[PDB]
Amino acid sequence: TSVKPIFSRDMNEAKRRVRELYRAWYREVPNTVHLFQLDISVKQGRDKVREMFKKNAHITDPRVVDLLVIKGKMELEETIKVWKQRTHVMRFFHETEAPRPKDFLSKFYVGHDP
Amino acid sequence: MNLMLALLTNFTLATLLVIIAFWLPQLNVYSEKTSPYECGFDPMGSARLPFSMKFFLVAITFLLFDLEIALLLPLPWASQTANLNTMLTMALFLIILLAVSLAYEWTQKGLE
Amino acid sequence: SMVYMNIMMAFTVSLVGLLMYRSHLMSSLLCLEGMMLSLFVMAALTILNSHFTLASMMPIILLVFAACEAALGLSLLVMVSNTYGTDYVQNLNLLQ
Amino acid sequence: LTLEGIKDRVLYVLKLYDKIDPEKLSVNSHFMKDLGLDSLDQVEIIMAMEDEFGFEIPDIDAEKLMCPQEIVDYIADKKD
Amino acid sequence: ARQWQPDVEWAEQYGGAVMYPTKETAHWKPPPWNDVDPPKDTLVSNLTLNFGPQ
Numbered sequence: 001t002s003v004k005p006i007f008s009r010d011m012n013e014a015k016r017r018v019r020e021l022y023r024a025w026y027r028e029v030p031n032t033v034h035l036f037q038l039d040i041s042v043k044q045g046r047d048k049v050r051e052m053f054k055k056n057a058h059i060t061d062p063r064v065v066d067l068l069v070i071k072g073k074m075e076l077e078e079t080i081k082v083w084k085q086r087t088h089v090m091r092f093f094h095e096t097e098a099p100r101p102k103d104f105l106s107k108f109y110v111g112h113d114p
Numbered sequence: 115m116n117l118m119l120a121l122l123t124n125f126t127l128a129t130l131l132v133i134i135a136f137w138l139p140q141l142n143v144y145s146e147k148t149s150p151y152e153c154g155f156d157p158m159g160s161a162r163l164p165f166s167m168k169f170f171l172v173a174i175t176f177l178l179f180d181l182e183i184a185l186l187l188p189l190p191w192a193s194q195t196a197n198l199n200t201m202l203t204m205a206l207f208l209i210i211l212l213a214v215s216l217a218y219e220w221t222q223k224g225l226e
Numbered sequence: 227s228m229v230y231m232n233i234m235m236a237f238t239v240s241l242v243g244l245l246m247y248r249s250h251l252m253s254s255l256l257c258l259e260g261m262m263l264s265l266f267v268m269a270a271l272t273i274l275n276s277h278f279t280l281a282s283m284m285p286i287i288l289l290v291f292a293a294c295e296a297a298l299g300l301s302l303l304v305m306v307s308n309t310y311g312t313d314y315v316q317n318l319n320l321l322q
Numbered sequence: 323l324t325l326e327g328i329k330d331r332v333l334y335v336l337k338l339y340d341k342i343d344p345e346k347l348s349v350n351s352h353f354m355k356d357l358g359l360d361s362l363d364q365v366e367i368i369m370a371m372e373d374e375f376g377f378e379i380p381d382i383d384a385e386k387l388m389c390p391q392e393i394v395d396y397i398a399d400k401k402d
Numbered sequence: 403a404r405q406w407q408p409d410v411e412w413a414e415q416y417g418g419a420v421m422y423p424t425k426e427t428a429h430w431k432p433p434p435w436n437d438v439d440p441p442k443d444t445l446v447s448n449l450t451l452n453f454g455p456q
Contacts, residue, residue, distance in 0.1 A: 019362075165311075319441070
């Protein structure tokens, strides 16, 4: 592997960097719930964040984790400020979309092998 | 005794036409979505009203130029008079006394 | 007559509890400029029926200072909000 | 300024989190070797000290604490 | 040396906050040795207007 990294070196500065920005998002859940005038319960906004970080824990490599940092670092520009007009935030909460079957027999009635 | 019935006509005709527009033909109980909208063609303004210095000095400066036109106001009544060397030389004083108050402030106005 | 009792009852727009209190100090500077016209009128009712012919220049001059006075006092009330943003008369630091 | 008053504050934090720890107010909960959590979930627990008793959580010490003994001891030389 | 007792404690007992003579009360504050400017808090994030699809 002959390529320079982005920020980290090996497995330790990376896995303290990802723990840094989690304390930003944990602080900046109960701000946007009134900064956009959106009416839900505040514990919903904290459940989505602790859901989202456990998704990517299958990585065995540096600078891939560092790539996800840059996306995670960027969103705190728009979210902590007011650049999303109430609608780009609420797309994480799929309220409209109908539930998927996800079990074998219910797929077999409706749909040609999804 | 009409001065005083020369204006209470004019204000009761004024308040008539506003309540036959704001009230009466109005009452919006249907859908009338008064949600979070109506925010003056914008969004949420989390900042309050900030102080602006260059728009305070415009208030005070006018007020001190407004006073001594009321001193200057009875100049046409000061014509049909007695001793008039006094009346001329005192009338010219206040205007210069208004003029110097420019020229001192005129060396520092700012972007007004 | 009764045109002097009202208004001498209306001179009690000082009333000193509401001449510096409570907070939003603009409410207190309000009745300092509103204490005039209880002096501008109470003079004007007396000079005018009793034909003095000369003292009626004094109600004209009564406004000219009290306008310039209160304008000075309003300059400093920006300076208390230039340092804070709120006037709030329960600001006190220099004891006595 | 009381050494026991900071042992108060550390020892009603943990069950106030409705997650893993079941009323274990021991000082010897050693947090993913005695108690048992995820590596991510401890990071929440440290953050509560800014508004509860007042604190900064400055540095890499949050990767180091791992027990409410060590939480009190770093608060101990922080204040008294 | 010998002459009298010009001791240190006569400066701190006269130590200037309020001169608590016969009791201790809600003292003022160790008043500033320089000219008096503690409360420096003057800042605002200026207005964020969008002259956008207006």
